[PDB]
């Protein structure tokens, strides 16, 4: 039984690969010669946010494009007014090993999680004036890698126990558990339409999921070792990736295969974060090299570098407005670029 | 006015300094070991679904935070990157166990990890009590798993505890030497292994951790001050 099923699965995999090869009548590099290269993109540190005691692990801009929450391994979430550097809040955490943080799209809540396997929801607007733990979403059997709000009531989270899940915050239950990954799930990106989301795992594969149906739709595998970061192209039909294999990859949902890979032979270190600019023309990735490289998403050539960090660049984000780019590092300083 | 916002920010920064003092005063420790190892008994006997546990204990006016990782996938390729730049890693093994080769492989993986290349390891050769009578009885032979023990004799620098049968000393020092060779092969001097013959009932575990942390900080400052 097992051998026959393996043969059938291999036949299906061969069919999928043949279909993808047939669809690859052209590659992005040939098409993108029709557009002018972006050229030299230079950004300067407009702000430097300090106050975190230890390594910064995560950060997330608010939809207002001004406030941004940040997390550090010392057990603090600090909300910054990036314009003025004012510390709007400072939330002490139950567990100091926080690996992710999110800002609710409405701006009312922030979430965080880490090696505690619990996604804590914090209410930034309560009549007592303090910041209160609204919910403690428990049920994952591994550390939390990423989380992103869908609504004030729904949040999707990745875990190191190979599962992503969708949570109903009010009831504190898992609406639907996503399974199929074989290794630790390291990051997830929520589509602009909010109906689909894609997560990369410690295996070579990044999988696309449908929250309404609660099941994987397709899988991508064009990576060598381990996917650390993932981001959705602004149009929502493509997503980037970052791996320990020291290269980015651009996939397309409709084509269902790799479109482009961004790497230079002199970059031999893993990628910790990935993000796109507002138009999607620039692909920004943070590396263990202590600096972030700006890639031309179409021409696939480096257009800049953000080297103003003293340690591993662990997180990276771009404002919904597209004005600025934030970055966090293990040196405990966030820096807004532009 | 936005001036009150700056006032709020400065109260926040005052609190951040206040807890920065506490953060810098405390020493963090990572606790590792297999389920056979009695690390749980060690932490429980620290007389001052969820993931990391925490134990707070103090020895001679200096406090420590020890982090025991609980419900997680068997792999630690990623979550051990968080525990970089801790003061020390405490590794606990069941000497009496045979899974000894599994413990050796685990210690190899921890020692050679690229994110823990500067973190000293406080190695607890735990459960000496069981090992002692396991060797004395003779119902099992360590040579079955490590035949090199048949042609091995206790070194000249060994210091057996007051009163000990030669065979138990030989066995315990053979295991300790296995771990020590593992440590030294890749050891470039940037981190050190501090082996200890420990049992969960021993009350010196806190003292041993404190002494090894004192030495680790001594060497860190010595390296900082260009003296090495």
């Amino acid at each position, epitope marked *: 039984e097992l051998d026959q099923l393996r043969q059938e699965a291999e036949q299906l995999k061969n069919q999928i690969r043949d279909a993808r090869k047939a669809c690859a009548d052209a590659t992005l590099s040939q098409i993108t010669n029709n557009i002018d290269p972006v050229g030299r993109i230079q950004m300067r540190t407009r702000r430097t946010l300090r106050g975190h005691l230890a390594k910064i692990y995560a950060m997330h801009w608010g939809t207002d494009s*001004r*406030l941004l929450v940040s997390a550090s391994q010392d057990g603090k979430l600090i909300i910054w*007014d990036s314009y003025t550097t*004012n510390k*709007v*809040h400072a939330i002490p955490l139950r567990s100091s090993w926080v690996m992710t943080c999110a800002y609710a799209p409405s*701006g009312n809540y922030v979430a965080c999680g880490g090696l505690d396997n619990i996604c804590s929801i914090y209410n930034l*607007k309560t*009549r*007592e*004036g*303090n910041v209160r733990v609204s919910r403690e979403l428990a049920g994952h059997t591994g550390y939390l890698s990423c989380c992103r709000f869908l609504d004030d009531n729904q949040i999707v989270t990745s875990s190191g126990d190979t599962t992503c899940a969708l949570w109903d915050i009010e009831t504190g239950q898992q609406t639907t558990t996503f399974t199929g990954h074989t290794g630790d799930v390291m990051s997830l990106s929520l589509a602009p339409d909010t109906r689909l989301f894609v997560s990369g795992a410690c295996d070579a594969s990044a999988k696309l999921w449908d929250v309404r149906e609660g099941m994987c739709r397709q899988t991508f595998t064009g990576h060598e070792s381990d996917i650390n970061a993932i981001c959705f192209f602004p149009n929502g039909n493509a997503f980037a990736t970052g791996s320990d294999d020291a290269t980015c990859r651009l996939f397309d949902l409709r084509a269902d295969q790799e479109l482009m890979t961004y790497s230079h032979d002199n970059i031999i270190c893993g990628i910790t974060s990935v993000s796109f600019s507002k138009s999607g023309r620039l692909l920004l990735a943070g590396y263990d090299d202590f600096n972030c490289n700006v890639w031309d998403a179409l021409k696939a050539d480096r257009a800049g570098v953000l080297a103003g960090h003293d340690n591993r660049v662990s997180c990276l984000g771009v404002t919904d407005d597209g004005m600025a780019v934030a970055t966090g590092s293990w040196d405990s300083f966030l820096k807004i670029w532009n | *006015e*936005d*001036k*009150a*916002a700056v*006032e*709020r920010s400065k*109260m926040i920064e*005052k609190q951040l300094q206040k807890d920065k003092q506490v953060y810098r005063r405390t020493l963090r420790l990572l606790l590792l070991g297999a389920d056979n190892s009695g690390k749980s008994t060690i932490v429980k006997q620290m007389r001052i679904t969820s993931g990391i546990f925490e134990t707070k204990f103090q020895v001679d006016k200096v406090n420590f935070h020890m982090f025991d990782v609980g419900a997680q996938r068997d792999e630690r390729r990623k979550w051990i990157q968080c525990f970089n730049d801790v003061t020390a890693i405490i590794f606990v093994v069941d000497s009496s166990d045979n899974r000894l080769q599994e413990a050796l492989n685990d210690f190899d993986s921890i020692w050679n990890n690229r994110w823990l290349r500067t973190i000293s390891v406080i190695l607890f050769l735990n459960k000496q009590d069981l090992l002692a009578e396991k060797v004395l009885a003779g119902k099992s032979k360590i040579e079955d798993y490590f035949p090199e023990f048949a042609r091995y004799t206790t070194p000249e620098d060994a210091t057996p505890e007051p009163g000990e049968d030669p065979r138990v000393t030989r066995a315990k020092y053979f295991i300790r030497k296995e771990f020590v060779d593992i440590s030294t092969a890749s050891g470039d001097g940037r981190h050190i292994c501090y082996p200890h013959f420990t049992c969960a009932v021993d009350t010196e575990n806190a003292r041993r951790i404190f002494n090894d942390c004192k030495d680790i900080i001594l060497q860190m400052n010595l390296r900082e001050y260009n003296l090495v």
Partner: single-chain antibody, 228 residues
């Protein structure tokens, strides 16, 4: 959330008294504190301000030096000593909650207050003292300021208060564009920089009272009343 002021009564002009209020239901430490007096048959007048953490303290020139404000965070008690009193000082004093940060709503809560009876500043004006109206439709209330309240930061520091008969003033709109927490969709506001307008989309009998406009670039307007 509950603020109750204590003290008041009858005091001779040459006497002194200490007004005390107890804060309950919220973190009094993080909330800034303002004192607002409501003299008989006239509008509100700011008295003093103390920042959170006993930091910046301000007094109105009419009461500068004469009064001193004290804060006690651990007891959640606010104190205000009046060394000497004049006849004009008679007024009902409110305990106005306030916290300041990007997106906050200062002056959101007003305490019950106590009546104390005794035996350059920015000037603003309102279009009319009274405006007869009926429920089920909208009306417009406007006010003017001596100088543009639009600071270089890109926002106007003005607030609107509603004082129902026998009830403390309530914050309707802050910064001319943001509705308070809990206020219904019955209110809206707009302006150009020097003249602002408060528009009630649909009036109801439960909102009877007098409207005050205040700027925080603290002085209040003459007050506009709605006659149903």
């Amino acid at each position: 959330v509950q603020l109750v002021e204590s003290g008041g009564g009858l005091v001779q002009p040459g006497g002194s008294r200490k007004l005390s209020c107890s804060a309950s239901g919220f973190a009094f430490s993080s909330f800034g504190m303002h004192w607002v007096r409501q003299a008989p048959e006239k509008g509100l007048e700011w008295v003093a301000y103390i920042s959170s953490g006993s930091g910046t303290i301000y007094y109105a020139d009419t009461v500068k030096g004469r009064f001193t404000i004290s804060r006690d965070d651990p007891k959640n008690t606010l104190f205000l000593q009046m060394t000497s009193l004049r006849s004009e000082d008679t007024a009902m004093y409110y305990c106005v909650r306030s916290i300041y940060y990007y997106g906050s709503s200062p002056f959101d809560f007003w305490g019950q207050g106590t009546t104390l009876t005794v035996s350059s500043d920015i000037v603003m004006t309102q279009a009319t003292s009274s405006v007869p109206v009926t429920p089920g439709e909208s009306v417009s209330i406007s006010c003017r300021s001596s100088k543009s309240l639009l600071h270089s930061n890109g926002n106007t520091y003005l607030y609107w208060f509603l004082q129902r008969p026998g009830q403390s003033p309530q914050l309707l709109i802050y910064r001319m564009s943001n509705l308070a927490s809990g206020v219904p969709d019955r209110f809206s506001g707009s302006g150009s920089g020097t003249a602002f307008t408060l528009t009630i989309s649909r009036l109801e009998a439960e909102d009877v009272g007098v409207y005050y406009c205040m700027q925080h670039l603290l002085t209040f307007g003459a007050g506009t009343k709605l006659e149903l």
